[PDB]
Amino acid sequence: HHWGYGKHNGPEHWHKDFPIAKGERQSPVDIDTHTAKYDPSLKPLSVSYDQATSLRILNNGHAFNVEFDDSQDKAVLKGGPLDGTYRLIQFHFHWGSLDGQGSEHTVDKKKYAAELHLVHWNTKYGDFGKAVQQPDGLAVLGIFLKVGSAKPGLQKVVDVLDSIKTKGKSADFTNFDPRGLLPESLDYWTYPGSLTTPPLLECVTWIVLKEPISVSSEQVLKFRKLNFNGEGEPEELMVDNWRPAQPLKNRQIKASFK
Ligand SMILES: Oc1ccccc1S
Numbered sequence: 001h002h003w004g005y006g007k008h009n010g011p012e013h014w015h016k017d018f019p020i021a022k023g024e025r026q027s028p029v030d031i032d033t034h035t036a037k038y039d040p041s042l043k044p045l046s047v048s049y050d051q052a053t054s055l056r057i058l059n060n061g062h063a064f065n066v067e068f069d070d071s072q073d074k075a076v077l078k079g080g081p082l083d084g085t086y087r088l089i090q091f092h093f094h095w096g097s098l099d100g101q102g103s104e105h106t107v108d109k110k111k112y113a114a115e116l117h118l119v120h121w122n123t124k125y126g127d128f129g130k131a132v133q134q135p136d137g138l139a140v141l142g143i144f145l146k147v148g149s150a151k152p153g154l155q156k157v158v159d160v161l162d163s164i165k166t167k168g169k170s171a172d173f174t175n176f177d178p179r180g181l182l183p184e185s186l187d188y189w190t191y192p193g194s195l196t197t198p199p200l201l202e203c204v205t206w207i208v209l210k211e212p213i214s215v216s217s218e219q220v221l222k223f224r225k226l227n228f229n230g231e232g233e234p235e236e237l238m239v240d241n242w243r244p245a246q247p248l249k250n251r252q253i254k255a256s257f258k
């Protein structure tokens, strides 16, 4: 059966195998900009990616992941709402079949064409597997993509997608610099939440950047030619791999800017 994003195994079904789906701190959420609270106690983010070592890009059947060496403090995130050092391990995207949908978080109900998740784990826990069992285990930088002008720093990724078209294909992907994917400002919203895919673990401190990056229609078109299926299986295009917004419940969205 295996979870996915179709009519018979999509988000509305996940709770049957993953009861945390109906949890207290699920993601994504809509960010109501008038109800978010400015917090002057919040620090600026510290992104230190100059020593990043990318290894591989992989189609895992529900997105593509770019993987990094996380055996040392090469690429890390500090500051913001975080205590401690968080190591970059991978990034992926979620995107839509149309330009008007694709992001997971929304801002005053507005949807963007895609959302970038840069995933980091708290080095006090020793490895990624242990971190995801902890309420402060991961920090995920969420960046919105809107369609407009091309993003130079995304094109090396776009170029290699045809070689990982189906589930289980991987390719070498060294010397990729993720700084090419950041917006110019690092102002953010932050709230405690979860993975937006199974197993939906409630271990994430979300950090959602205010400023979107722009990408060209031609760049996102190439995302939409990937396949959910494996080679030799009937073709299903990899589109709309996003989960709808979940109820905020007892949580406060905090803003770093006023
Ligand atoms: O947010 C971390 C790891 C894997 C997937 C998502 C986050 S969707």
Ligand SMILES: [Zn+2]
Pocket: 092, 093, 094, 117, 196
């Ligand atoms: Zn994600």
